[PDB]
RNA sequence: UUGGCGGAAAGGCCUUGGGUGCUUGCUGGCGAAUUGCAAUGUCAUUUUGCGUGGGGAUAAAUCAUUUGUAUACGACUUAGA
RNA sequence: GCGUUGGAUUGUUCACCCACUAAUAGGGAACGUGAGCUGGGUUUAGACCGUCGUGAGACAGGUUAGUUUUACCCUACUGAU
RNA sequence: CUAUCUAGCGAAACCACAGCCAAGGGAACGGGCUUGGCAGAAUCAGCGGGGAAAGAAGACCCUGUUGAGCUUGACUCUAGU
RNA sequence: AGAACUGGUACGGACAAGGGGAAUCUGACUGUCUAAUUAAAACAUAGCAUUGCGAUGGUCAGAAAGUGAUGUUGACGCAAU
RNA sequence: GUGAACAGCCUCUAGUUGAUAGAAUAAUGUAGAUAAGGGAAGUCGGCAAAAUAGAUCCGUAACUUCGGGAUAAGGAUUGGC
RNA sequence: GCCCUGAAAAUGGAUGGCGCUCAAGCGUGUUACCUAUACUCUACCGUCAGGGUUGAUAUGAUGCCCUGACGAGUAGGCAGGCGUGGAGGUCAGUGACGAAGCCUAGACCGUAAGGUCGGGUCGAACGGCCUCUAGUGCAGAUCUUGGUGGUAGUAGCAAAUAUUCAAAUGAGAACUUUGAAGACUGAAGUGGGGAAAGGUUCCACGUCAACAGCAGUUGGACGUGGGUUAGUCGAUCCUAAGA
RNA sequence: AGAACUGGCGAUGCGGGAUGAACCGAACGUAGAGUUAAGGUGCCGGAAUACACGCUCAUCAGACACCACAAAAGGUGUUAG
RNA sequence: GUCGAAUUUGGGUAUAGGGGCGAAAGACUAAUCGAACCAUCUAGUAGCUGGUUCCUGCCGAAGUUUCCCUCAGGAUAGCAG
RNA sequence: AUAUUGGCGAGAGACCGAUAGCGAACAAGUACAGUGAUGGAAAGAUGAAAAGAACUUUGAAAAGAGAGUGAAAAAGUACGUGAAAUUGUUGAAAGGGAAGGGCAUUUGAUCAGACAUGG
């Protein structure tokens, strides 16, 4: 409970989340915005695709000296990628979502992505052996996420 | 502080940037001046080059060493089918420059064309021209009109044409499409010899015979990104030079505190748009005969075809334009073909050259004979064979 | 609505025939206030979304796959109902 | 506008001689140019000689041997979406 | 084999604020000031012009009533003899 | 060891494996050292020369001693250059 | 096994197949090779590279402390059967 | 006099620029016009000076009131004040019906240091005024400790010839096990034991959060247990340089 | 480099000299209205493309104190003497 | 380079900081050497470099004199509060 | 009678309040370093009380989502408050080779000060 700033109804969304988890915040971070307001089932197939190596993630902020690729037109972009680890951590979480909106008792079919975000999580320190017997950090930059899915509201 | 001693600067600088070409068909940026008092005619043409070979003939240079005298000679041959006619352009004088007007196509329009216009021809409805058709259903009227127009007030006139590129042996099914400028008399006896030609045909013998110098225009074989000894000549550095030696030691003085615009670096070779003059022509090809590669000294029935075919490229079917030496572009890629922009009195110009025999032998390999039936008279009957 | 002309960016110009409103060329019959002694008053033209009633037209590009005349990656050039 | 060179001895710039040549002009750009090179000279520590000094040591004297770091940032430039 | 592109993993140096020039003047070589040239998102591979690039409070030189290694009929002493 | 026959005249067929020669400077030689910028012509050396000393002694050690090194020694010796 | 051989190369017993991986083959690199003609003209300087190389037989200079120099140099040969 | 010659230097450039030719150039003269923190008049703040005034008469006598002049500032001097921990005194001061603290392009007061207030957040203490006292105010010190960025998903993860197919187990397999192939170490070994040193790493079972710079079901990891048997192998005895 | 008197900069902003410590004008509490200084008034730029008499034509004109330089010597250019 | 000896080398033992050890480089003496390492004397001294924490109001400088192993510092007079 | 930064036993403070106070408020002369003499830290606070989240559900799990406990989960053994740097998301705006600042106003947002006069 406490998710950041919400503008949906809570009777017409199911929420979840993740934290301390393993995975690359900026590259996670790109593939979460990757699908921020689509509807549940066009993210899903399209992340699913992203493993495909059919479609690609664009990376937006974090993305200085990233490759380029042709995946990219799609969304007006030249520098994309397909950061497996970010979509599996993700989609796990869409999943949770999903089977929660659905105990909950909402139209699946209905259902889009309301709300997603990434934080950073507390840092994890290893350890790197520099030349001139030195030593620096060798750090994992874990990644918080947390989404919400909503009906979509019909005129 | 004044360098050492001199030496000339390496590379042109107008040939600059040396990038890559925008198309991979090079633009004429320059047609002939037109004379209107000679028949209408194209001024360039297209074609695909297809290999080179050997010539042998003898000189025509009264007070040279080899003068009566027997010269081997490199030459290109592009493959050069009939180009078709199906539009015309008309152009404007305008303080801003010249100016298209309008375009007047032509009724029917092959797939050949067609093609050009689309990204996707397999899944495409080929609407192509289908509603500018529908213009020549009235008894003439809105081409009509447009034709008058360009008679009007036009001041220069191009065809549109296109390969066949379908008459050789690539795999390209989409044929290239040029604009070409109607050099023949009046303003009106242009475009009538444009309307009068719509979908029909024209061949290199109505353009181009023999002895006639003509230049060649063309985008250069490519060879990607390229370091600066190669791409410009620059010398190699010692041999204990750390950090590599195909560099350039010294990039630019202090001031201006700015690599400068003429300064080698690496990058970019080939794929460059070149015109390139005083080409002679040596042998206009006719498809049709059986005798292409044939002399009046050498009469044995051969085509210009290689033994084994012209590698990479294929056979050669179809009318031919014989070029001295060589062409910018490789095998395969288009080439528009233009009339002299000038006169020349070169007498290295006006020597009119009759061969005497073409080296028909592979390429594909170090060939021993012209012709199928020497190499059997040579070797005599084989394992195979009967 | 009849003819024409305009290609320098013509996208406008002259011309023929009636139709229709206005006409301060002239002569009459009415109206106006109280918005209170100025504030505060004619609404111009851009786009853009929606609404209606009519006329109309019924494709492509990209991803992927493929060529190698191209290529560090993008890009380029081919091919596929 | 355009060229202004090949070499013997020297760490040399300079000097000088051979030779070619249309000509072998003079200079700048942090005495251009060391995250471009090279490291021969100079100018750390080893060492020999000569001169000087009682000596430790000295020399604008001769000599030999002596580790040449980093760009992935910004701009520039070259190419490329 | 790299560099290059991708999954995973993932540092460091350095950072007043920053990052296009020409002239001017100016602490007498400006990214910023003045006067002009100009000036169009976001970007990839290269590069070694420039950031007086970075890397140890200059090791040369001088100053300090600051040292230490060493030498000597400098000064003042001392184990010894 | 010798002879015949044989081959695209090859055959230490891969592997393995001294380039040579004429001189100058310089240290005789093998040997040694600046671990991490100097392997040298520097240090050493055999050889040569010089000096001191017969034990109550020469050279050296210790704050001192009924203390100690040379000395399990004695000049063909030990010590010092 | 080859061979002078505890060399190099190949194998048996025994032991490993462990050093992130996929796709491409731009520049510039690190490591390995090759170049027509010329043959040090490069350079402080042949630096780097190249050339020589086993074995049998023949042959072998100045000088010398008579021991050397000396694998001096220069040649012929080499498989298989 | 003006103009021309005399008059040659390195990025491309400077009457400031544009451009100007009976000038927008040079010499001279006449008027008008533009404009500084200066001058003239006035309001307000302060500082300084001169004066009036508690005569019985409500609320400041270090006060109220009238008048004139003046105002640059480093180093530095003095003055009047703002803010902090703790102390004496007093508002019988605020407070779980919410102290303090924190957040807030919300409000008000002061020239300012600062003060005050609303909303939010919170949870046990805390103000004002007169005085007392100092371990009393930060932007710097290549300051101290800690925390965090840009760099950057970048440099990179390229020495030691080399991997491949299938099955099995598992949520999950390039990496674990078994099978097969392909190869290496080549007995100067990637073989078999020991001395120093370690100290349980050995072995079995379970097992994967961290660690093995990809991964992991595997491990020298994690948890739990097991294991080292002597008259003959050493120590132990001996003496060595020496102590 | 170094003295004399004074005024400045340093310590000082404001207006002018494009720019600039030091020139010119003028020194500063918060402000309104007026007027000016030095300097300006074609356009950048607030303000007469004002008035008046001459001078000057440069295939290198010239354009404002400090100030961002020019000299000897020449000219049948042209002006006045 | 050298590779059967002035050979390489394990363990034990000995030598300790103005001391050792040195086939001699000021070399080595635990990544330390022209005097190791560790604590204390020690908050060693610094005419030198760096920093030195709130607001406003008033006044407001000196770089000159004399003396000083004085010349990057003091005393002294002046200027200032 | 005098001395007493050691030992035992006590009474105190205009001292400090976890980067302060002894180095140590804690399994502190501890963990760790060094051949050795020596060097020597970091580290206190859920709640009145574990009432430490039964149970359902998605997951391989860790966890999520419900539910539940509690005065509070805006206290979940990462735990009082929870600032700053720095960061995600949402919303508003601007952006031809920095940004930021001064005087002035347009435009948008926001906020005010006013109150009492017969029915
Ligand atoms: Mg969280
Ligand atoms: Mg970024
Ligand atoms: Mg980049
Ligand atoms: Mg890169
Ligand atoms: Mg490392
Ligand atoms: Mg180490
Ligand atoms: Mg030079
Ligand atoms: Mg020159
Ligand atoms: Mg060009
Ligand atoms: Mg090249
Ligand atoms: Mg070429
Ligand atoms: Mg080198
Ligand atoms: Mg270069
Ligand atoms: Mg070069
Ligand atoms: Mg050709
Ligand atoms: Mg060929
Ligand atoms: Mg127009
Ligand atoms: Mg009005
Ligand atoms: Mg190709
Ligand atoms: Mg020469
Ligand atoms: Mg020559
Ligand atoms: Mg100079
Ligand atoms: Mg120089
Ligand atoms: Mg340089
Ligand atoms: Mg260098
Ligand atoms: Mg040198
Ligand atoms: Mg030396
Ligand atoms: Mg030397
Ligand atoms: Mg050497
Ligand atoms: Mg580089
Ligand atoms: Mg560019
Ligand atoms: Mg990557
Ligand atoms: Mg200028
Ligand atoms: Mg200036
Ligand atoms: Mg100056
Ligand atoms: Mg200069
Ligand atoms: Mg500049
Ligand atoms: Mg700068
Ligand atoms: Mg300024
Ligand atoms: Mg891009
Ligand atoms: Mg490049
Ligand atoms: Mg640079
Ligand atoms: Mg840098
Ligand atoms: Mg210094
Ligand atoms: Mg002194
Ligand atoms: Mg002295
Ligand atoms: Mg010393
Ligand atoms: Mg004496
Ligand atoms: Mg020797
Ligand atoms: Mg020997
Ligand atoms: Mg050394
Ligand atoms: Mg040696
Ligand atoms: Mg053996
Ligand atoms: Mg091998
Ligand atoms: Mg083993
Ligand atoms: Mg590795
Ligand atoms: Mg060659
Ligand atoms: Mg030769
Ligand atoms: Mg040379
Ligand atoms: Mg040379
Ligand atoms: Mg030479
Ligand atoms: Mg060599
Ligand atoms: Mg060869
Ligand atoms: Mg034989
Ligand atoms: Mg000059
Ligand atoms: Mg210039
Ligand atoms: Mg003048
Ligand atoms: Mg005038
Ligand atoms: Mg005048
Ligand atoms: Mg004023
Ligand atoms: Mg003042
Ligand atoms: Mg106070
Ligand atoms: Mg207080
Ligand atoms: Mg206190
Ligand atoms: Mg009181
Ligand atoms: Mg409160
Ligand atoms: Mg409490
Ligand atoms: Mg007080
Ligand atoms: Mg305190
Ligand atoms: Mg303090
Ligand atoms: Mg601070
Ligand atoms: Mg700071
Ligand atoms: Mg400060
Ligand atoms: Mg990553
Ligand atoms: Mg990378
Ligand atoms: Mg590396
Ligand atoms: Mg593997
Ligand atoms: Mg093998
Ligand atoms: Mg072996
Ligand atoms: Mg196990
Ligand atoms: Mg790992
Ligand atoms: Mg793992
Ligand atoms: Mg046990
Ligand atoms: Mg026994
Ligand atoms: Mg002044
Ligand atoms: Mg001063
Ligand atoms: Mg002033
Ligand atoms: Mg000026
Ligand atoms: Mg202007
Ligand atoms: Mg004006
Ligand atoms: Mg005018
Ligand atoms: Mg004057
Ligand atoms: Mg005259
Ligand atoms: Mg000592
Ligand atoms: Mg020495
Ligand atoms: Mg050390
Ligand atoms: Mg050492
Ligand atoms: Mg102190
Ligand atoms: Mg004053
Ligand atoms: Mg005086
Ligand atoms: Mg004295
Ligand atoms: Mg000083
Ligand atoms: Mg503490
Ligand atoms: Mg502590
Ligand atoms: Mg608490
Ligand atoms: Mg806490
Ligand atoms: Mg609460
Ligand atoms: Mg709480
Ligand atoms: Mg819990
Ligand atoms: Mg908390």
């Given at each position: 409970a406490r998710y950041g700033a919400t503008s949906t109804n809570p009777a017409k969304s199911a929420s979840a989340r993740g934290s301390y988890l393993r995975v690359s915040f900026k590259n996670t971070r790109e593939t979460a915005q990757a699908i921020n307001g689509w509807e549940l089932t066009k993210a899903q197939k399209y992340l699913e695709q992203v493993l495909d190596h059919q479609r690609a993630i664009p990376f937006r902020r974090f993305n200085s000296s990233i490759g380029r690729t042709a995946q990219g037109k799609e969304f007006g972009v030249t520098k994309a990628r397909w950061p497996a680890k970010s979509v599996k951590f993700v989609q796990g979480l869409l999943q949770n979502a999903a089977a929660n909106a659905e105990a909950k008792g909402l139209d699946a079919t209905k259902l889009y992505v309301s709300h997603i975000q990434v934080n950073q999580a507390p840092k994890q320190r290893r350890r790197t052996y520099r030349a001139h017997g030195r030593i620096n950090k060798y750090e994992s930059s874990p990644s918080h996420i947390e989404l919400v899915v909503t009906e979509k509201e019909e005129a | 502080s004044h360098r050492k001693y001199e030496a000339p600067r390496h590379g042109h600088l107008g040939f600059l940037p040396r990038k890559r070409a925008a198309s991979i068909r090079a633009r004429v940026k320059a047609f002939p001046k037109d004379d209107r008092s000679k028949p209408v005619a194209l001024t360039s043409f297209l074609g695909y080059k297809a290999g080179m070979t050997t010539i042998v003939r003898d000189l025509d240079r009264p007070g040279s060493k080899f003068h009566k005298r027997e010269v081997v000679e490199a030459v290109t041959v592009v493959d050069t089918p009939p180009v078709v006619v199906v539009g015309v352009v008309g152009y404007v004088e305008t303080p801003r420059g010249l100016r298209s007007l309008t375009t007047v196509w032509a009724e029917h329009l092959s797939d050949e064309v067609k093609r050009?216009?689309?990204?996707?021809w397999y899944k495409s409805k080929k609407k192509a021209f289908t509603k500018y058709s529908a213009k020549y259903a009235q008894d003439g009227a809105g081409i009509e009109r447009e034709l008058a127009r360009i008679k009007k007030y036009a001041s220069v006139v191009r065809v549109l044409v296109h390969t066949q590129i379908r008459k050789t042996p690539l795999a390209q099914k989409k044929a290239h499409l040029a604009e070409i400028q109607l050099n023949g008399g009046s303003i009106s006896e242009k475009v009538d010899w444009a309307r009068e030609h719509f979908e029909k045909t024209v061949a290199v013998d109505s353009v181009f015979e023999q002895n006639e110098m003509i230049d060649a225009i063309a985008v250069t074989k490519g060879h990607g990104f390229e370091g600066v000894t190669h791409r410009w000549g620059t010398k190699k550095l010692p041999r204990k030079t750390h950090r590599g030696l195909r560099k350039v030691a010294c990039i630019g003085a202090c001031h201006p505190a700015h690599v400068m615009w003429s300064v080698a670096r690496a990058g970019q070779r080939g794929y460059h748009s070149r015109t390139s003059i005083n080409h002679k022509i040596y042998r206009v090809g006719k498809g049709d005969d059986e005798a292409n590669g044939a002399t009046s000294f050498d009469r044995t029935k051969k085509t210009i075809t290689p033994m084994g075919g012209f590698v990479h490229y294929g056979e050669i079917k179809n009318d031919f334009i014989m070029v001295k030496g060589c062409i910018p572009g490789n095998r395969k890629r288009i080439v528009t073909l233009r009339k002299s922009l000038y006169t020349n009195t070169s007498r290295k110009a006006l020597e009119e050259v009759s061969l005497k025999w073409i080296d028909t032998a592979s390429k594909f390999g170090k060939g021993r004979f012209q012709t199928p039936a020497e190499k059997h008279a040579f070797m005599g009957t084989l394992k195979k064979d009967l």
């Amino acid at each position: 409970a406490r998710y950041g700033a919400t503008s949906t109804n809570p009777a017409k969304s199911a929420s979840a989340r993740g934290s301390y988890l393993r995975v690359s915040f900026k590259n996670t971070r790109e593939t979460a915005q990757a699908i921020n307001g689509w509807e549940l089932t066009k993210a899903q197939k399209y992340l699913e695709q992203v493993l495909d190596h059919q479609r690609a993630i664009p990376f937006r902020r974090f993305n200085s000296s990233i490759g380029r690729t042709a995946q990219g037109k799609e969304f007006g972009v030249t520098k994309a990628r397909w950061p497996a680890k970010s979509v599996k951590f993700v989609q796990g979480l869409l999943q949770n979502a999903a089977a929660n909106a659905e105990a909950k008792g909402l139209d699946a079919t209905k259902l889009y992505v309301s709300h997603i975000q990434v934080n950073q999580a507390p840092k994890q320190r290893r350890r790197t052996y520099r030349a001139h017997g030195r030593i620096n950090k060798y750090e994992s930059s874990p990644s918080h996420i947390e989404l919400v899915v909503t009906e979509k509201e019909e005129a | 502080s004044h360098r050492k001693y001199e030496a000339p600067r390496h590379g042109h600088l107008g040939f600059l940037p040396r990038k890559r070409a925008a198309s991979i068909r090079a633009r004429v940026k320059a047609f002939p001046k037109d004379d209107r008092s000679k028949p209408v005619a194209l001024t360039s043409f297209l074609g695909y080059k297809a290999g080179m070979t050997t010539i042998v003939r003898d000189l025509d240079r009264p007070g040279s060493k080899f003068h009566k005298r027997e010269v081997v000679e490199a030459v290109t041959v592009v493959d050069t089918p009939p180009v078709v006619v199906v539009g015309v352009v008309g152009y404007v004088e305008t303080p801003r420059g010249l100016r298209s007007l309008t375009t007047v196509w032509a009724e029917h329009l092959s797939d050949e064309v067609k093609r050009r216009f689309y990204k996707n021809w397999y899944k495409s409805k080929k609407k192509a021209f289908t509603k500018y058709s529908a213009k020549y259903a009235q008894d003439g009227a809105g081409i009509e009109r447009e034709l008058a127009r360009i008679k009007k007030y036009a001041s220069v006139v191009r065809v549109l044409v296109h390969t066949q590129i379908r008459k050789t042996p690539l795999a390209q099914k989409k044929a290239h499409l040029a604009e070409i400028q109607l050099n023949g008399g009046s303003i009106s006896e242009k475009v009538d010899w444009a309307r009068e030609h719509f979908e029909k045909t024209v061949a290199v013998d109505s353009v181009f015979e023999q002895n006639e110098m003509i230049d060649a225009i063309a985008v250069t074989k490519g060879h990607g990104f390229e370091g600066v000894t190669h791409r410009w000549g620059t010398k190699k550095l010692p041999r204990k030079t750390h950090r590599g030696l195909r560099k350039v030691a010294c990039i630019g003085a202090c001031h201006p505190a700015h690599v400068m615009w003429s300064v080698a670096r690496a990058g970019q070779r080939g794929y460059h748009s070149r015109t390139s003059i005083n080409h002679k022509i040596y042998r206009v090809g006719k498809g049709d005969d059986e005798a292409n590669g044939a002399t009046s000294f050498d009469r044995t029935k051969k085509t210009i075809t290689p033994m084994g075919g012209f590698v990479h490229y294929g056979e050669i079917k179809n009318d031919f334009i014989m070029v001295k030496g060589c062409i910018p572009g490789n095998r395969k890629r288009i080439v528009t073909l233009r009339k002299s922009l000038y006169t020349n009195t070169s007498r290295k110009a006006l020597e009119e050259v009759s061969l005497k025999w073409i080296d028909t032998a592979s390429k594909f390999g170090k060939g021993r004979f012209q012709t199928p039936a020497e190499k059997h008279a040579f070797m005599g009957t084989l394992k195979k064979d009967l």
